[PDB]
């Protein structure tokens with residue numbers, strides 16, 4: 001990985017914090033002749049354990065193996081000086097879940113579907129690279145000023161450990177139940193096909209402008225509903241093709257789910273023939289307004 005000297009990094013504002021470090025927006029100056037570029041910077045505070053160092057630098061190591069438009073790009077690391085830092089491109093619109101909730105109703109259906117195609121292309125790349133995400137969710141997608149959505153949050157075990165949506169289960173594992181495929185919940189089987197289930201949940205998150213999956217149902221009630229065969233209902237204003245696709249992501253039998261290649265192909269064809277998105281799935285209303 002590229003080693004960046006600390007004098008090249010200016011931390012400007014905290015944008016995220018945890019117990020063992022923070023995420024900042026800042027600037028990176030590589031050379032005398034080129035203007036500084038905005039970056040995100042994540043630190044690791046003094047006293048970190050061996051495991052913390054391995055996990056922290058391991059996220060950078062994984063990210064440095066990837067080169068794809070829809071995967072967060074690493075600028076480099078500070079490892080020769082303390083505090084250690086990871087420096088990435090700066091995604092101006094932040095996390096997709098919060099972005100959607102703050103921009104409710106502001107996009108066209110075609111823009112929303114384009115977000116999904118970008119996420120799907122990043123996931124196809126990760127799956128092809130033999131990288132299983134385990135925590136695919138709108139909160140772990142970042143959005144730039146071109147509306148490009150990039151997958152983020154990498155690592156072997158730090159990902160689920162660090163995410164407060166991942167909760168301890170009766171069996172002892174820590175997982176984000178509402179996003180996780182049944183085989184991953186039941187027996188800890190995380191594969192690219194469990195990431196496909198999660199992708200279907202992200203599709204529902206995007207098309208609802210960031211609604212919370214399953215609304216107020218508890219984690220146990222979500223699992224019971226999925227095992228009973230229930231699935232999330234159609235969002236309002238959702239293209240039929242898009243709801244069909246998310247429902248195929250949620251097949252109980254892992255082998256019946258589409259692969260990411262199939263998802264990318266379908267989304268790209270829908271976008272290329274955008275009238276295809278004008279046919280909407282029926283929406284089931286919770287409330288009846290009657291007027292004479």
Ligand SMILES: CCc1cc(Nc2ncc(C(=O)Nc3c(C)cccc3Cl)s2)cc(C(=O)NC2CCNCC2)c1
Pocket residue numbers: 015016023025040041042059072086087088089090091092093094095142152153
């Ligand atoms: C987490 C929420 C978030 C994210 C970002 N942009 C980011 N871009 C890259 C980030 C990052 O975390 N990079 C990263 C680093 C630095 C190290 C390891 C892994 C990763 Cl993925 S965070 C920017 C903001 C932010 O403060 N403001 C924007 C403007 C105000 N409204 C929200 C978006 C908020």
